[model samples]
Target: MQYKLILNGKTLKGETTTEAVDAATAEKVFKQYANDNGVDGEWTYKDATKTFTVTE
Candidate 1:
């Protein structure tokens, strides 16, 4: 499976993965990515700035 993490319509470095385990896991990974990178405000399941997609 392939997981993509897009922030504000752009893909950041180290945000794409081919071994994300699953979609839910991918979300967790991306959440950490956002937190690590210092994203503003709270991280929610349906945030406006972040978009997550899965490609099989």
Candidate 2:
């Protein structure tokens, strides 16, 4: 599973950066971001990204 962290700012909008392979990892990264920036504002998770794997 892939997760995207969409960043919404005052002037600019529709920004994002995906940095995890799963929800929990993403959540941790999100927490780090919050700790660094101290922003517990509006954000979202969408089906905006995915992957296609070929396995045996």
Candidate 3:
């Protein structure tokens, strides 16, 4: 399964999962996504759920 990135209560446009093998890689993808989408604030990666939650 692929890892997903979610901006908490916010929404994203044309956002997709990252080709991540682990949490570390997923964080990298999150950074790129943030840069591309101008995302900021606190974020966390949940390994159990395989998702990244960006809580602004």
Overall lDDT per candidate, in order of appearance? 0.53, 0.50, 0.72
Task: For model 1, give the RMSD to the true fold.
Answer: 7.7
Tens-digit per-residue lDDT, 1-56, candidate 1 = 56556455223333454356666786777778666765543333433433473221
Candidate 3 residue-wise lDDT, 25-48, digit = tens: 778878787778666668776778
lDDT by residue for model 2 (1-56), tens: 55545555543334345557776677667657655654556544444453211111
Model 1, position 47: C-alpha lDDT score: 35
Show where candidate 2 strays beyond 4 Å. Answer: 9-14, 42-56
RMSD of each: 7.7, 9.9, 2.6
State every prediction's TM-score relative to the real structure: 0.54, 0.46, 0.71
- lDDT score of residue 38 within candidate 1: 59
Report the poorest 10 consecutive residues by lDDT, candidate 2: 47-56
Candidate 3 residue pairs in clash (backbone atoms < 3 Å): none
lDDT for model 1 comes to 0.53
Error of 1 at 29 (Å): 0.5
